[PDB]
Amino acid sequence: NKKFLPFQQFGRDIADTTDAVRDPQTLEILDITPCSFGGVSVITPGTNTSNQVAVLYQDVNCTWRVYSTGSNVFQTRAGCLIGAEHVNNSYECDIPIGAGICASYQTQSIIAYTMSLGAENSVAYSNNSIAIPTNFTISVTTEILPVSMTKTSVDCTMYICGDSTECSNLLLQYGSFCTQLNRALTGIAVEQDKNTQEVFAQVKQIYKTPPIKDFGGFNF
Amino acid sequence: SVAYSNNSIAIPTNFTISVTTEILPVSMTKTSVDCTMYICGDSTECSNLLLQYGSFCTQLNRALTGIAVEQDKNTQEVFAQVKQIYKTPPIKDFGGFNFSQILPDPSKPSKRSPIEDLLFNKVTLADAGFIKQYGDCLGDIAARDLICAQKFNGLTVLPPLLTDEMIAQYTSALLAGTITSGWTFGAGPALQIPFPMQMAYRFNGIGVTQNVLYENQKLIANQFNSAIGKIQDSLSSTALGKLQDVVNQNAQALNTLVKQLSSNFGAISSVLNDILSRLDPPEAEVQIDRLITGRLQSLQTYVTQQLIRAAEIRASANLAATKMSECVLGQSKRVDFCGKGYH
Amino acid sequence: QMAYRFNGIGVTQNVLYENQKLIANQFNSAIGKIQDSLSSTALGKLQDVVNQNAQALNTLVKQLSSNFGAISSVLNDILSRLDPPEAEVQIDRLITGRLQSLQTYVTQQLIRAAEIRASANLAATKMSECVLGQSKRVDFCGKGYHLMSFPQSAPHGVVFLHVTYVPAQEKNFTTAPAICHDGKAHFPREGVFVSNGTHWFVTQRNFYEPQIITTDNTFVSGNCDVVIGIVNNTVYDPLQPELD
Numbered sequence: 001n002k003k004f005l006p007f008q009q010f011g012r013d014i015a016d017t018t019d020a021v022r023d024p025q026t027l028e029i030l031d032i033t034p035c036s037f038g039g040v041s042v043i044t045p046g047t048n049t050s051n052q053v054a055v056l057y058q059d060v061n062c063t064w065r066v067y068s069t070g071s072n073v074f075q076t077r078a079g080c081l082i083g084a085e086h087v088n089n090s091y092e093c094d095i096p097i098g099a100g101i102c103a104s105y106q107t108q109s110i111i112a113y114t115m116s117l118g119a120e121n122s123v124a125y126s127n128n129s130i131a132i133p134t135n136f137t138i139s140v141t142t143e144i145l146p147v148s149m150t151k152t153s154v155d156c157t158m159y160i161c162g163d164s165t166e167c168s169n170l171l172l173q174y175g176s177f178c179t180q181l182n183r184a185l186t187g188i189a190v191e192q193d194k195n196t197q198e199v200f201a202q203v204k205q206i207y208k209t210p211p212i213k214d215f216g217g218f219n220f
Numbered sequence: 221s222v223a224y225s226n227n228s229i230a231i232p233t234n235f236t237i238s239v240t241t242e243i244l245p246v247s248m249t250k251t252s253v254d255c256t257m258y259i260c261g262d263s264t265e266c267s268n269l270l271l272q273y274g275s276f277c278t279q280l281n282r283a284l285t286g287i288a289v290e291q292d293k294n295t296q297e298v299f300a301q302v303k304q305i306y307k308t309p310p311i312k313d314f315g316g317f318n319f320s321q322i323l324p325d326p327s328k329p330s331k332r333s334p335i336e337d338l339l340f341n342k343v344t345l346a347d348a349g350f351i352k353q354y355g356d357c358l359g360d361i362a363a364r365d366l367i368c369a370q371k372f373n374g375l376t377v378l379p380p381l382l383t384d385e386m387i388a389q390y391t392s393a394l395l396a397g398t399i400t401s402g403w404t405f406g407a408g409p410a411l412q413i414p415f416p417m418q419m420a421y422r423f424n425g426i427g428v429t430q431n432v433l434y435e436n437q438k439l440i441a442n443q444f445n446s447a448i449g450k451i452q453d454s455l456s457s458t459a460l461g462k463l464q465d466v467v468n469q470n471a472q473a474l475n476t477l478v479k480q481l482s483s484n485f486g487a488i489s490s491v492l493n494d495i496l497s498r499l500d501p502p503e504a505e506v507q508i509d510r511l512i513t514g515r516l517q518s519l520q521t522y523v524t525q526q527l528i529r530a531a532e533i534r535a536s537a538n539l540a541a542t543k544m545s546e547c548v549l550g551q552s553k554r555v556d557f558c559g560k561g562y563h
Numbered sequence: 564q565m566a567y568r569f570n571g572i573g574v575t576q577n578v579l580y581e582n583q584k585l586i587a588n589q590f591n592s593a594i595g596k597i598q599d600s601l602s603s604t605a606l607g608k609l610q611d612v613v614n615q616n617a618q619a620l621n622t623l624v625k626q627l628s629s630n631f632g633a634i635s636s637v638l639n640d641i642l643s644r645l646d647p648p649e650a651e652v653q654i655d656r657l658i659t660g661r662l663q664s665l666q667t668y669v670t671q672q673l674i675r676a677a678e679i680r681a682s683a684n685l686a687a688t689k690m691s692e693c694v695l696g697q698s699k700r701v702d703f704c705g706k707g708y709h710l711m712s713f714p715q716s717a718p719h720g721v722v723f724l725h726v727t728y729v730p731a732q733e734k735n736f737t738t739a740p741a742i743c744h745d746g747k748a749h750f751p752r753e754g755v756f757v758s759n760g761t762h763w764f765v766t767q768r769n770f771y772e773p774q775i776i777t778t779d780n781t782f783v784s785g786n787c788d789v790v791i792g793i794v795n796n797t798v799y800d801p802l803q804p805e806l807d
């Protein structure tokens with residue numbers, strides 16, 4: 001529907017790509033739209049257990065631009081999932097498809113379902129009722145936190161030029177860059193030691209446990 | 221000026237129950253980029269010449285996938301503290317306290333509270349859904365709808381794993397647990413307790429005796445209801461800038477990437493079709509390489525800024541999760557951590 | 564020390580001084596269970612650091628096969644069959660490409676180092692608040708009421724064994740906010756009013772330990788006309804038997 005002026009032949013968008021073109025014989029305006037469109041994802045349960053896959057087409061509304069149609073076509077808010085069977089149950093998420101849908105390798109085939117948030121529960125609120133425990137449990141849980149990473153150093157001359165003397169001579173125009181890289185790496189390297197010292201060196205007195213292991217029944 | 225003296229004190233005779241809002245971003249949009257379609261498009265010669273930067277493109281996609289998984293991890297950490305979906309009883313007798321503005325409304329297609337709906341209607345996203353068909357924008361609609369313009373260049377937005385309905389269910393479960401059991405559901409088996417008694421306990425947490433509430437229950441309930449209504453009105457009147465900024469920055473970055481395709485980068489033209497037509501392969505390779513280098517550097521810049529923004533959002537989400545665990549699942553003694561005053 | 568930490572979470576020390584054997588057995592069993600839960604299955608958060616660093620170095624090595632727009636990716640093949648004046652262009656292309664690769668690696672390392680520094684600061688705060696003391700922050704040193712923590716050394720990280728208090732075996736009781744005896748409203752000092760159906764008692768919140776309502780257990784404020792859910796009971800004064 002664009003109306004070109006008589007002196008114009010091509011049309012360009014904000015990316016400078018050609019969008020509208022006038023046919024030089026019929027003098028009608030035509031639009032150019034790319035042929036490729038839409039995202040594609042593959043869901044695999046691991047190649048060491050099965051070869052079967054399911055493909056999720058994120059720009060298709062199945063109610064097509066698909067590689068193959070097969071069977072078990074299921075529509076989700078994240079796209080059209082082909083190669084997986086829909087179930088009405090609800091389990092914990094195993095492979096995240098998206099938009100509340102997850103996938104798993106159950107009974108073999110690939111199945112898709114709506115993830116369950118957890119067991120439904122209700123607390124009996126009353127105006128004059130309270131719940132007070134009569135017993136207790138002492139539980140121990142693990143919490144793992146990284147503290148440091150590997151310290152690395154880089155030599156530009158050896159990485160870029162190797163033993164090439166001509167390249168090494170040509171590299172003298174970029175020495176500030178290597179100074180900067182080595183400075184950053186040295187900062188990282190000293191920061192890791194600072195991290196370890198901060199986390200573990202809170203106390204500077206090495207207390208020792210005595211041979212009297214009588215802790216009242218607690219065994220450490 | 222404080223009239224200081226060594227034998228004078230000021231002790232209050234009254235109090236105010238105030239409600240304040242605090243906004244914290246938790247996540248950002250998950251994006252992915254197709255190197256071939258962005259740098260080259262449908263150009264076979266450019267696609268063949270791009271095979272010298274495969275490790276770079278794999279690195280970009282790895283970083284973007286890491287960010288995408290990280291966003292889901294942040295949302296799960298913030299909202300999935302409890303794995304039991306508590307429901308509020310039909311007995312709405314909370315001793316005079318009214319939670320109708322923070323409890324779900326069954327008259328809506330979703331199960332959102334009034335205030336939640338008011339918040340949802342005050343933040344404008346860029347993708348009304350995540351299914352934009354090829355036939356939906358075919359023709360002059362392209363290069364006019366920014367989402368279609370981005371998609372034609374390989375810039376895709378991936379949907380969140382947890383939908384808004386599930387997030388609302390999580391929030392409703394948290395609210396029901398708090399108003400039905402106090403802070404006991406965050407440490408073990410949930411134990412029921414009346415809400416007056418819970419508020420008396422939480423008064424005891426700030427150094428004021430429980431008989432004050434047990435004697436001023438009606439006044440405190442009226443003040444709480446009025447404060448909730450005032451919060452609703454102040455939200456309706458005025459903003460969610462911290463949440464709008466995330467979507468604005470993501471959209472601006474994607475549109476900047478789209479617009480950056482008009483740069484020559486030192487070539488004779490910025491369009492591969494004009495380079496390929498009227499130039500023969502060996503001398504069009506120079507221009508194609510220049511364009512490839514420029515566009516790959518642009519993608520690197522976008523990925524780096526996305527990583528920095530993702531780190532900032534991770535900090536915000538960690539703070540939000542800590543604040544949830546310490547103010548919603550319990551009572552905080554930290555000054556100015558869960559509002560101004562005694563929490 | 565265990566009795567003190569019990570007092571820190573709102574449970575009196577006599578509970579532990581009476582159940583010491585049970586608590587000791589439970590703690591030993593919990594340590595044995597974490598032994599097995601670690602032996603059988605993972606330390607992914609710590610393996611990820613070494614995996615990412617190794618992958619970054621490996622991909623830096625692998626990116627030496629990129630032409631970067633040159634006719635070959637090996638400086639020896641460029642320098643042989645090309646004289647300096649026209650080999651300088653290819654060498655410059657390769658230098659620019661490899662410099663960009665190094666800069667990208669440095670940027671990713673800086674971002675990862677910032678993330679690891681945040682983790683290390685969190686670990687330092689966690690140690691200072693859970694190992695060197697007892698934290699009242701909810702869900703900071705584990706799920707439940709925090710008792711203590713034990714740090715363990717791990718490759719490129721720290722591992723905490725959080726000892727927590729998790730209540731169990733709850734029971735139903737009837738409650739009331741106040742008891743008024745002689746026209747005066749009595750409220751509990753450090754407990755809650757409960758009833759097994761016929762008699763009224765005051766007990767601590769985290770453990771069922773009923774006691775008789777006396778003048779030491781409660782305090783007086785007002786009459787029987789202000790509070791809403793008041794119920795009637797006798798409050799035993801431990802002075803009449805002492806004068807009788």
Ligand SMILES: *[C@@H]1O[C@H](CO)[C@@H](O[C@@H]2O[C@H](CO)[C@@H](O)[C@H](O)[C@H]2NC(C)=O)[C@H](O)[C@H]1NC(C)=O
Pocket residue numbers: 061062063076077078349351
């Ligand atoms: C795929 O397309 C169908 C229609 O072709 C969509 O179904 C419609 O959804 C709207 C949303 O409000 C309803 O008002 C219509 O009544 C629906 N029509 C039918 C026939 O069901 C469907 O929503 C699309 N898929 C997605 C993920 O949006």
Ligand SMILES: *[C@@H]1O[C@H](CO)[C@@H](O[C@@H]2O[C@H](CO)[C@@H](O)[C@H](O)[C@H]2NC(C)=O)[C@H](O)[C@H]1NC(C)=O
Pocket residue numbers: 124129131733734735
């Ligand atoms: C305290 O007693 C109440 C009943 O007076 C319990 O609440 C009921 O629990 C049953 C469990 O089978 C449910 O079927 C009812 O729907 C609940 N509602 C009622 C009638 O209150 C409550 O569970 C008891 N407390 C505890 C901790 O179990």
Ligand SMILES: *[C@@H]1O[C@H](CO)[C@@H](O[C@@H]2O[C@H](CO)[C@@H](O)[C@H](O)[C@H]2NC(C)=O)[C@H](O)[C@H]1NC(C)=O
Pocket residue numbers: 134135136585588589732
């Ligand atoms: C509190 O729980 C503990 C264990 O969780 C109970 O101890 C058990 O009691 C049974 C009953 O005789 C014994 O058979 C077990 O051997 C005990 N376990 C241990 C580890 O000693 C305890 O009885 C419970 N207390 C109450 C009041 O119910």
Ligand SMILES: *[C@@H]1O[C@H](CO)[C@@H](O[C@@H]2O[C@H](CO)[C@@H](O)[C@H](O)[C@H]2NC(C)=O)[C@H](O)[C@H]1NC(C)=O
Pocket residue numbers: 213219220591595
């Ligand atoms: C403290 O308890 C630990 C529990 O692990 C004891 O260590 C071993 O426990 C197993 C299980 O009962 C026994 O079969 C082993 O024989 C124990 N080790 C040894 C060397 O005997 C540990 O022995 C206990 N310490 C004390 C002083 O009783």
Ligand SMILES: *[C@@H]1O[C@H](CO)[C@@H](O[C@@H]2O[C@H](CO)[C@@H](O)[C@H](O)[C@H]2NC(C)=O)[C@H](O)[C@H]1NC(C)=O
Pocket residue numbers: 312318319320321
């Ligand atoms: C809690 O507040 C809501 C309003 O925020 C109350 O709902 C209104 O109640 C009034 C008085 O009966 C009616 O005139 C309105 O039609 C109700 N609708 C609205 C505006 O929500 C609700 O009644 C309050 N809770 C209780 C227990 O009274």
Ligand SMILES: *[C@@H]1O[C@H](CO)[C@@H](O[C@@H]2O[C@H](CO)[C@@H](O)[C@H](O)[C@H]2NC(C)=O)[C@H](O)[C@H]1NC(C)=O
Pocket residue numbers: 233234235439442443
């Ligand atoms: C403490 O403050 C509250 C509110 O700030 C006072 O309650 C108000 O009292 C006036 C006059 O009696 C009423 O018009 C208002 O409606 C009341 N407010 C509410 C929310 O109901 C209360 O009187 C003050 N008490 C003292 C001792 O000063």
Ligand SMILES: *[C@@H]1O[C@H](CO)[C@@H](O[C@@H]2O[C@H](CO)[C@@H](O)[C@H](O)[C@H]2NC(C)=O)[C@H](O)[C@H]1NC(C)=O
Pocket residue numbers: 759760761762
């Ligand atoms: C509730 O607890 C009271 C505790 O006083 C029980 O009353 C006593 O019960 C014992 C035996 O159960 C008797 O020997 C006492 O004479 C009773 N009175 C007193 C003052 O101790 C009462 O039986 C309990 N009720 C229920 C239903 O368990």
Ligand SMILES: *[C@@H]1O[C@H](CO)[C@@H](O[C@@H]2O[C@H](CO)[C@@H](O)[C@H](O)[C@H]2NC(C)=O)[C@H](O)[C@H]1NC(C)=O
Pocket residue numbers: 795
């Ligand atoms: C709780 O006890 C009080 C006093 O023991 C009761 O107060 C009575 O109130 C009525 C009418 O208000 C008077 O006619 C009586 O004379 C009062 N009692 C006394 C001893 O003076 C109150 O009714 C009791 N509450 C319940 C629920 O039984």
Ligand SMILES: *[C@@H]1O[C@H](CO)[C@@H](O)[C@H](O)[C@H]1NC(C)=O
Pocket residue numbers: 048049
């Ligand atoms: C995966 O397959 C490999 C080789 O087939 C095998 O060695 C490995 O044990 C498998 N993994 C599992 C979890 O079975």
Ligand SMILES: *[C@@H]1O[C@H](CO)[C@@H](O)[C@H](O)[C@H]1NC(C)=O
Pocket residue numbers: 086087088
């Ligand atoms: C699932 O439940 C729906 C309810 O509408 C029903 O139509 C359908 O037959 C059931 N089976 C599956 C797995 O879809």
Ligand SMILES: *[C@@H]1O[C@H](CO)[C@@H](O)[C@H](O)[C@H]1NC(C)=O
Pocket residue numbers: 127128313314315414416791792
């Ligand atoms: C529960 O309801 C009863 C009667 O409706 C009332 O007397 C009592 O005060 C209510 N409970 C609370 C905590 O207000």
Ligand SMILES: *[C@@H]1O[C@H](CO)[C@@H](O)[C@H](O)[C@H]1NC(C)=O
Pocket residue numbers: 214215216217
């Ligand atoms: C230490 O020994 C005494 C008696 O010898 C005992 O009563 C006490 O419980 C022991 N200490 C501990 C911690 O068990």
